[PDB]
Design an enzyme around this catalytic site. Structure first.
Site, PDB file in Angstrom:
ATOM      1  N   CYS A   1       1.771   3.634  -3.053  1.00 24.40           N
ATOM      2  CA  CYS A   1       0.861   4.650  -3.546  1.00 24.40           C
ATOM      3  C   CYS A   1       0.289   5.555  -2.464  1.00 24.40           C
ATOM      4  CB  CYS A   1      -0.338   3.966  -4.188  1.00 24.40           C
ATOM      5  SG  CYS A   1       0.007   3.055  -5.720  1.00 24.40           S
ATOM      6  N   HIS A   2       0.248   5.061  -1.223  1.00 22.91           N
ATOM      7  CA  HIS A   2      -0.364   5.870  -0.169  1.00 22.91           C
ATOM      8  C   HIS A   2       0.686   6.519   0.716  1.00 22.91           C
ATOM      9  CE1 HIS A   2      -4.622   5.078  -0.987  1.00 22.91           C
ATOM     10  NE2 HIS A   2      -4.301   3.834  -1.285  1.00 22.91           N
TER      11      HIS A   2
ATOM     12  N   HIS B   1      10.871  21.081 -14.877  1.00 26.32           N
ATOM     13  CA  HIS B   1      10.696  19.637 -14.891  1.00 26.32           C
ATOM     14  C   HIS B   1      11.104  19.112 -16.270  1.00 26.32           C
ATOM     15  CE1 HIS B   1       8.857  15.700 -15.321  1.00 26.32           C
ATOM     16  NE2 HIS B   1       8.790  15.612 -13.999  1.00 26.32           N
TER      17      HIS B   1
ATOM     18  N   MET C   1      -7.097   2.647  -7.845  1.00 24.79           N
ATOM     19  CA  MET C   1      -7.012   1.895  -6.588  1.00 24.79           C
ATOM     20  C   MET C   1      -7.475   0.478  -6.874  1.00 24.79           C
ATOM     21  SD  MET C   1      -6.616   1.216  -3.286  1.00 24.79           S
ATOM     22  CE  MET C   1      -7.646   0.203  -2.191  1.00 24.79           C
TER      23      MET C   1
ATOM     24  N   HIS D   1      15.408  16.678  -8.434  1.00 26.31           N
ATOM     25  CA  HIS D   1      14.457  15.698  -8.961  1.00 26.31           C
ATOM     26  C   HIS D   1      15.061  15.011 -10.180  1.00 26.31           C
ATOM     27  CE1 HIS D   1      10.649  13.698  -9.240  1.00 26.31           C
ATOM     28  NE2 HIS D   1      10.494  14.117 -10.476  1.00 26.31           N
TER      29      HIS D   1
ATOM     30  N   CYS E   1       0.767  -1.229   0.000  1.00 18.64           N
ATOM     31  CA  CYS E   1       0.000   0.000   0.000  1.00 18.64           C
ATOM     32  C   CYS E   1       0.803   1.287   0.000  1.00 18.64           C
ATOM     33  CB  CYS E   1      -0.872   0.110   1.282  1.00 18.64           C
ATOM     34  SG  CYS E   1      -1.898  -1.338   1.617  1.00 18.64           S
TER      35      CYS E   1
HETATM   36  C1  DHE Z   1      12.440  10.212  -9.253  1.00 17.54           C
HETATM   37  C2  DHE Z   1      11.557  10.179 -10.511  1.00 17.54           C
HETATM   38  C3  DHE Z   1      11.937  10.007 -11.777  1.00 17.54           C
HETATM   39  C4  DHE Z   1      13.361   9.761 -12.361  1.00 17.54           C
HETATM   40  C5  DHE Z   1      13.600   8.266 -12.599  1.00 17.54           C
HETATM   41  C6  DHE Z   1      14.951   7.816 -13.080  1.00 17.54           C
HETATM   42  O1  DHE Z   1      15.888   8.642 -13.007  1.00 17.54           O
HETATM   43  O2  DHE Z   1      15.022   6.631 -13.509  1.00 17.54           O
HETATM   44  C7  DHE Z   1      10.767  10.062 -12.615  1.00 17.54           C
HETATM   45  C8  DHE Z   1      10.756   9.921 -13.987  1.00 17.54           C
HETATM   46  C9  DHE Z   1       9.640   9.884 -14.792  1.00 17.54           C
HETATM   47  C10 DHE Z   1       9.629   9.679 -16.223  1.00 17.54           C
HETATM   48  C11 DHE Z   1      10.912   9.507 -17.069  1.00 17.54           C
HETATM   49  C12 DHE Z   1      11.032  10.402 -18.296  1.00 17.54           C
HETATM   50  C13 DHE Z   1      12.288  10.259 -19.122  1.00 17.54           C
HETATM   51  O3  DHE Z   1      12.179  10.347 -20.370  1.00 17.54           O
HETATM   52  O4  DHE Z   1      13.354  10.063 -18.492  1.00 17.54           O
HETATM   53  C14 DHE Z   1       8.351   9.682 -16.622  1.00 17.54           C
HETATM   54  C15 DHE Z   1       7.787   9.498 -18.045  1.00 17.54           C
HETATM   55  C16 DHE Z   1       7.528   9.865 -15.445  1.00 17.54           C
HETATM   56  C17 DHE Z   1       6.156   9.972 -15.478  1.00 17.54           C
HETATM   57  C18 DHE Z   1       5.398  10.379 -14.414  1.00 17.54           C
HETATM   58  N1  DHE Z   1       5.866  10.622 -13.136  1.00 17.54           N
HETATM   59 FE1  DHE Z   1       7.753  10.328 -12.433  1.00 17.54          FE
HETATM   60  N2  DHE Z   1       7.159  10.868 -10.595  1.00 17.54           N
HETATM   61  C19 DHE Z   1       7.948  10.878  -9.461  1.00 17.54           C
HETATM   62  C20 DHE Z   1       9.309  10.576  -9.419  1.00 17.54           C
HETATM   63  C21 DHE Z   1      10.122  10.333 -10.508  1.00 17.54           C
HETATM   64  N3  DHE Z   1       9.663  10.248 -11.810  1.00 17.54           N
HETATM   65  C22 DHE Z   1       7.166  11.356  -8.355  1.00 17.54           C
HETATM   66  O5  DHE Z   1       7.732  11.523  -6.943  1.00 17.54           O
HETATM   67  C23 DHE Z   1       6.013  11.822  -8.877  1.00 17.54           C
HETATM   68  C24 DHE Z   1       6.230  13.353  -9.059  1.00 17.54           C
HETATM   69  C25 DHE Z   1       4.789  11.498  -8.048  1.00 17.54           C
HETATM   70  C26 DHE Z   1       4.575  10.232  -7.719  1.00 17.54           C
HETATM   71  O6  DHE Z   1       3.918   9.907  -6.670  1.00 17.54           O
HETATM   72  O7  DHE Z   1       4.983   9.223  -8.366  1.00 17.54           O
HETATM   73  C27 DHE Z   1       5.896  11.282 -10.221  1.00 17.54           C
HETATM   74  C28 DHE Z   1       4.815  11.369 -11.065  1.00 17.54           C
HETATM   75  C29 DHE Z   1       4.775  11.050 -12.403  1.00 17.54           C
HETATM   76  C30 DHE Z   1       3.601  11.062 -13.247  1.00 17.54           C
HETATM   77  O8  DHE Z   1       2.207  11.455 -12.753  1.00 17.54           O
HETATM   78  C31 DHE Z   1       3.963  10.636 -14.463  1.00 17.54           C
HETATM   79  C32 DHE Z   1       3.810  11.841 -15.428  1.00 17.54           C
HETATM   80  C33 DHE Z   1       3.177   9.447 -14.979  1.00 17.54           C
HETATM   81  C34 DHE Z   1       3.144   8.324 -14.278  1.00 17.54           C
HETATM   82  O9  DHE Z   1       3.447   7.216 -14.831  1.00 17.54           O
HETATM   83  O10 DHE Z   1       2.814   8.224 -13.054  1.00 17.54           O
HETATM   84  N4  DHE Z   1       8.342  10.009 -14.337  1.00 17.54           N
HETATM   85  C1  HEC Z   2      -1.548   2.199  -6.388  1.00 13.88           C
HETATM   86  C2  HEC Z   2      -1.706   1.301  -7.401  1.00 13.88           C
HETATM   87  C3  HEC Z   2      -2.426   1.833  -5.121  1.00 13.88           C
HETATM   88  C4  HEC Z   2      -2.197   0.810  -4.303  1.00 13.88           C
HETATM   89  C5  HEC Z   2      -1.128  -0.299  -4.408  1.00 13.88           C
HETATM   90  C6  HEC Z   2      -3.200   0.889  -3.260  1.00 13.88           C
HETATM   91  N1  HEC Z   2      -3.980   2.010  -3.469  1.00 13.88           N
HETATM   92 FE1  HEC Z   2      -5.513   2.651  -2.310  1.00 13.88          FE
HETATM   93  N2  HEC Z   2      -5.873   4.123  -3.621  1.00 13.88           N
HETATM   94  C7  HEC Z   2      -5.131   4.446  -4.751  1.00 13.88           C
HETATM   95  C8  HEC Z   2      -5.738   5.584  -5.406  1.00 13.88           C
HETATM   96  C9  HEC Z   2      -5.200   6.240  -6.704  1.00 13.88           C
HETATM   97  C10 HEC Z   2      -6.802   5.939  -4.684  1.00 13.88           C
HETATM   98  C11 HEC Z   2      -7.828   7.077  -4.934  1.00 13.88           C
HETATM   99  C12 HEC Z   2      -9.151   6.472  -5.438  1.00 13.88           C
HETATM  100  C13 HEC Z   2     -10.114   7.395  -6.123  1.00 13.88           C
HETATM  101  O1  HEC Z   2     -11.023   6.796  -6.731  1.00 13.88           O
HETATM  102  O2  HEC Z   2      -9.949   8.638  -6.057  1.00 13.88           O
HETATM  103  C14 HEC Z   2      -6.925   5.022  -3.571  1.00 13.88           C
HETATM  104  C15 HEC Z   2      -7.893   5.048  -2.585  1.00 13.88           C
HETATM  105  C16 HEC Z   2      -7.940   4.267  -1.448  1.00 13.88           C
HETATM  106  C17 HEC Z   2      -8.878   4.379  -0.354  1.00 13.88           C
HETATM  107  C18 HEC Z   2     -10.035   5.399  -0.307  1.00 13.88           C
HETATM  108  C19 HEC Z   2      -9.759   6.675   0.467  1.00 13.88           C
HETATM  109  C20 HEC Z   2     -10.690   7.832   0.253  1.00 13.88           C
HETATM  110  O3  HEC Z   2     -10.392   8.906   0.840  1.00 13.88           O
HETATM  111  O4  HEC Z   2     -11.688   7.655  -0.484  1.00 13.88           O
HETATM  112  C21 HEC Z   2      -8.547   3.461   0.560  1.00 13.88           C
HETATM  113  C22 HEC Z   2      -9.214   3.134   1.915  1.00 13.88           C
HETATM  114  C23 HEC Z   2      -7.387   2.748   0.075  1.00 13.88           C
HETATM  115  N3  HEC Z   2      -7.034   3.255  -1.160  1.00 13.88           N
HETATM  116  C24 HEC Z   2      -6.759   1.702   0.731  1.00 13.88           C
HETATM  117  C25 HEC Z   2      -5.712   0.955   0.228  1.00 13.88           C
HETATM  118  C26 HEC Z   2      -5.083  -0.167   0.879  1.00 13.88           C
HETATM  119  C27 HEC Z   2      -5.477  -0.684   2.281  1.00 13.88           C
HETATM  120  C28 HEC Z   2      -4.150  -0.630   0.043  1.00 13.88           C
HETATM  121  C29 HEC Z   2      -3.177  -1.834   0.340  1.00 13.88           C
HETATM  122  C30 HEC Z   2      -3.783  -3.053   0.136  1.00 13.88           C
HETATM  123  C31 HEC Z   2      -4.153   0.172  -1.151  1.00 13.88           C
HETATM  124  N4  HEC Z   2      -5.104   1.162  -1.006  1.00 13.88           N
HETATM  125  C32 HEC Z   2      -3.296   0.003  -2.213  1.00 13.88           C
HETATM  126  C33 HEC Z   2      -4.019   3.766  -5.191  1.00 13.88           C
HETATM  127  C34 HEC Z   2      -3.513   2.623  -4.613  1.00 13.88           C
HETATM  128  C1  LIG Z   3       8.094  12.302 -12.794  1.00 15.63           C
HETATM  129  N1  LIG Z   3       8.586  13.198 -12.267  1.00 15.63           N
END
Ligand code: DHE
Ligand code: HEC
Ligand SMILES: [C-]#N
Ligand code: DHE
Ligand code: HEC
Ligand SMILES: [C-]#N
Lengths: 519, 520
Positions: free
Chosen positions: A20-21, A340, A58, A297, A17
């Site tokens: 993503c969380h 960026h 999710m 970054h 979890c």
């Molecule tokens: C540290 C990092 C790298 C460099 C990797 C490497 O050097 O190998 C990277 C690269 C990237 C690259 C590499 C581009 C390239 O040509 O090198 C891409 C396409 C990318 C698409 C996205 N990134 Fe990324 N990215 C993060 C972190 C990073 N992203 C985040 O912390 C962030 C901002 C939020 C998050 O929770 O993940 C985030 C959200 C995104 C997106 O919403 C994007 C647009 C789409 C997606 O798949 O989630 N990230």
């Molecule tokens: C990335 C692929 C995820 C993983 C792995 C898990 N969750 Fe998640 N969760 C994710 C997103 C993008 C969202 C938002 C959903 C939306 O429709 O906007 C969520 C949401 C939840 C929630 C709801 C919270 C709310 O405020 O409505 C819960 C309770 C939640 N997720 C729990 C949860 C748990 C326990 C996980 C581990 C098994 C888990 N998530 C994995 C993305 C991702």
């Molecule tokens: C992707 N930053």
């Protein structure tokens, strides 16, 4: 929960979890799952959400069978509790997660498929937890491979044989592109939260090592380039560069590989340090800890592959490192908000000489920095130009040595008329007199021929010859997405890739251009 | 129930003035554990009396010395009944706040302005007095007694011999200019809550440029300006153990030495078993070599050619050898004894084995020799060539000098007063590397001093500039009589006994010249 129930809950959270969380339930891609919000939603809302998931990304943990009946509820109850202390993830935990499906001895000794491996595209299928391997000339999906939830990026070994993918949870997959049916030959987990992976690219070190960086725990790990075996774990906990105070959780951002020395180039965000880590000797480990700027970054190598240019994004600065001398060479304000670059875009400006460009998330500007200290010393490491493109919310800028055009997306812009399009400036027409370079607007989303959801266009990626540029038309998980191929020479639609399996396509990586760092 | 302000106040005092000896988690070091399970039983009154009047076993008289007010003493007594606070960090801001330059460099002498013979001076640790005594190596006169601070542990000299650096267990660093008419602290700083080591830059061309201090808490080292003590670069030592590769939140810095091959500091990181080679050429684009070694690193020394670093991983009974020229581990060997404790050790040319380095042991009476000459004695290099008995267990220091043929081995912690008051002496020239245990002469140092009352423990030999005389500390309690015994190297006879009312609990002794050139 009893003491043991909380432990299973806590174990499941960190492994499945936190990617993503977040480690402190503050949310990342997933929403904040802290108590404040969690008590008001209540048990029932949480049980249902963990069971059914949502099209926003999710997972349906309950209905997929991924978590059996009773784990949804442990994970419903646990979420009401206060945030556990994030655990460490050392050698013992990595070795337990490390699996070698096909030993190196049992792998092909030559490509055993007829694919054009260097012109292949490895595309991230965000919400499907998979990558798609797509043929660069015939535009067909060669293979769809499962990596794991929250897949982020793909990187290639220096020979182009090995494909490495990493997801947000620290899950690393190694794929052998020489197999009849390319598949994961090795896998491993390197933390609770991670984003970066990279291969040794110093001439002579082809396929030797891979390195992965974690957001949490604060560390990077160097792994064997053929088995994923974890050889050296380095903590990135340390002191900030400007105030020299201890920082308990410095995340590892982008990681690149030197071409001048057998080193990995590691960005350490919160401490403002860039590490040059020598992999010639892992027991007597040599490093250069470079004081730079906080908020590091992404970044890329200049056109000559000697200077590392990276965004200290919240401070609006570009940091430049000389990888041959191993030292900081410049820190400059782009004049824009939140640069960026991705890996950025290197080209020869008609009047300024060799430059590297970056677009911005907070405004419509594009900035150019001079990257030739030997032949253009008065322009080196200075912002030479700054002009607007489509609008704010830009994530990626791209070019290639065989083209005269500079592509700039606008992915996060509020207006769909903008976020579904791409700006293109003619490099050869650039003068540098004040006049804003004009740009051509490609109707990327319109060319996809889609109406549903909220398609956003992101990141141009060229094929191996530099004649065509690909863009992802990124749409929701239950909606139609696509990849648009633009003909570089004519700036016209070349081909539109649509497929049932093309779920939330985002990052796209051409094998040849990634293995050689051509951008 | 104590207020927030009072509590913050008590905490600052605790970490600033108590942790040095009582530990950052109050579990004890030289001072007793002060965790609430012991203190609540002792009670307020007992704690208040103790803090007020201290004790002759080394606990300062905080109230009676006026260092703490009566309010503060009661403040500290209530604080000790409470659960231990979370140990704080100690970064740049906290270091700079403690940083004090008493005599700017532009205002100091440009030449030695005293008549002393600086190179043959001995900087002696007056353990429970919070001072160092500067003593003339030939006249045996106490030239001066300087306040450094409680918990003073050791003295080190800058490469030129002008600046004397002392460090205490609380991480208090004092810099003393030996050129002044009247030498004193010209600058000071605090680098942590608990610390033990300091060293000066000794690469030719870097004379007097830098000083480095290593802390036990927080886990970090600081590189400071060699003339003003300005903190220039702080590095955390938090990290992974070398062998199991698991995060370790409290890796203490043990001994710090200086390379003579490259402009580098040699830092031992105890719990992770890492030896760091830190380049001080450019602190912003900082280069380091992190050497995986053996856990429980503590003390060590350079071999006779000054190329290789030899150090004990004491609880694992190993000697770790690092080449400072190539910056790589070269060897790890078991000494065959329990807990090697070499200090900087002893280098000498063995009659049949060649150049060797020796160490004695805390856990047993063995003395081990390791060959230190890869060029001329390839087969003996980095191998334990001989192991033989000295007085008995409890040994801490072994010593010799290029101008002497004898190897002196103390036995400070032995439970038998006869042994712990004596020193074993070996004739290097009579050794044979044939398996037979060399014989030793027993020197009755405590007896020579005329000290019998209390518990006189003889510790650490230290030679004078010419290597003609070796000094030993007759360590007795603060309320007992102590002394320094000067032994004539040529005859192995008593040369002189140093006694003085100010010579309180004398322990480590450092000859200016031998310390500045790493002669041992
Ligand atoms: C540290 C990092 C790298 C460099 C990797 C490497 O050097 O190998 C990277 C690269 C990237 C690259 C590499 C581009 C390239 O040509 O090198 C891409 C396409 C990318 C698409 C996205 N990134 Fe990324 N990215 C993060 C972190 C990073 N992203 C985040 O912390 C962030 C901002 C939020 C998050 O929770 O993940 C985030 C959200 C995104 C997106 O919403 C994007 C647009 C789409 C997606 O798949 O989630 N990230
Ligand atoms: C990335 C692929 C995820 C993983 C792995 C898990 N969750 Fe998640 N969760 C994710 C997103 C993008 C969202 C938002 C959903 C939306 O429709 O906007 C969520 C949401 C939840 C929630 C709801 C919270 C709310 O405020 O409505 C819960 C309770 C939640 N997720 C729990 C949860 C748990 C326990 C996980 C581990 C098994 C888990 N998530 C994995 C993305 C991702
Ligand atoms: C992707 N930053
Ligand atoms: C890390 C360290 C060093 C190396 C310093 C350097 O390289 O600059 C050192 C050196 C030393 C040296 C250096 C001698 C040399 O020739 O290099 C000496 C004499 C010394 C006398 C003592 N030390 Fe020491 N000492 C400690 C730590 C250290 N001592 C301890 O952790 C310990 C064991 C207990 C403590 O809490 O401080 C401890 C107890 C003692 C003593 O009881 C000694 C015998 C006497 C005393 O004054 O307390 N330590
Ligand atoms: C080293 C120089 C010390 C410093 C600085 C402080 N203390 Fe201490 N303390 C030290 C020793 C060696 C001892 C043991 C004394 C003995 O006679 O054996 C002590 C003891 C105490 C006690 C008594 C505990 C007991 O079990 O009897 C107390 C309450 C105590 N010390 C408190 C204290 C405080 C509050 C300090 C900061 C001002 C402090 N000590 C500093 C050595 C050293
Ligand atoms: C102390 N050794």
């Amino acid at each position: 929960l009893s003491d043991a129930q909380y432990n299973e809950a806590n174990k499941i959270y960190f492994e499945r979890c936190a990617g993503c969380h977040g480690v402190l339930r503050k949310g990342a891609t997933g929403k904040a799952l802290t108590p404040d919000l969690t008590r008001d939603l209540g048990f029932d809302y949480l049980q249902s959400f963990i069971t059914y998931g949502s099209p926003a990304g999710m997972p349906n943990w309950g209905t997929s069978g991924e978590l059996s009946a009773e784990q949804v509820d442990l994970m419903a109850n646990y979420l009401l509790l206060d945030p556990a202390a994030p655990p460490e993830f050392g050698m013992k935990e990595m070795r337990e997660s490390w699996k070698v499906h096909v030993a190196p001895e049992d792998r092909p000794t030559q490509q055993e498929n007829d694919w054009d491996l260097e012109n292949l595209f490895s595309v991230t299928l965000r919400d499907a937890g998979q990558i798609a391997l797509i043929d660069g000339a015939t535009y067909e999906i060669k293979s769809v491979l499962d990596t794991g939830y929250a897949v982020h990026i793909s990187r290639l070994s220096a020979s182009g044989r090995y494909l490495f993918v990493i997801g947000r949870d620290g899950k690393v997959n190694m794929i052998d592109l020489w197999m009849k049916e390319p598949t994961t030959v090795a896998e491993i987990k390197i933390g609770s939260e991670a984003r970066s992976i990279e291969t040794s690219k110093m001439e002579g070190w082809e396929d030797k090592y891979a390195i992965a960086g974690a957001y949490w725990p604060p560390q990077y790990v160097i792994m064997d380039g053929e088995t994923l075996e974890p050889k050296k774990i380095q903590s990135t906990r340390g002191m900030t560069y400007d105030e020299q105070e201890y920082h308990p959780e410095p995340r590892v951002a982008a990681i690149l590989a030197s071409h001048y020395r057998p080193e990995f180039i590691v960005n350490v965000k919160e401490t403002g340090k860039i590490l040059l880590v020598d992999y010639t000797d892992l027991d007597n480990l040599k490093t250069t800890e470079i004081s730079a700027e906080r908020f590091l970054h992404d970044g890329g190598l200049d056109g000559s592959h000697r200077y590392f240019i990276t965004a200290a994004n919240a401070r609006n600065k570009l940091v430049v490192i000389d990888t041959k001398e191993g030292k900081l060479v410049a820190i400059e304000d782009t004049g824009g908000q939140t640069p960026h670059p991705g890996r950025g875009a290197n080209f020869v400006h008609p009047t300024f000489g060799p430059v590297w460009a970056t677009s911005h998330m907070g405004d419509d500007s594009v900035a150019l920095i001079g990257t030739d200290p030997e032949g253009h010393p008065d322009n080196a490491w200075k912002i030479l130009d700054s002009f607007p493109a489509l609008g704010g919310g830009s994530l990626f800028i791209k070019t290639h040595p065989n083209s005269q055009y500079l592509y700039v997306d606008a992915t996060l812009n509020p207006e769909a008329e903008i976020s579904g399009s791409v700006a293109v400036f003619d490099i050869k027409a650039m003068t540098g007199d004040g006049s804003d370079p004009e740009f051509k607007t490609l109707p990327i989303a319109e060319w996809a021929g889609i109406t549903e959801g909220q398609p956003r266009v992101v990141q141009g990626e060229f094929n191996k010859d530099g004649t065509e540029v690909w863009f992802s038309v990124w749409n929701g998980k239950d909606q139609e997405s696509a990849l648009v191929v633009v003909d570089d020479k004519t700036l016209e639609l070349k081909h539109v890739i649509k497929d049932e399996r093309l779920v939330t396509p985002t990052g796209k990586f051409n094998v040849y251009n990634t293995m050689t760092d051509t951008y």
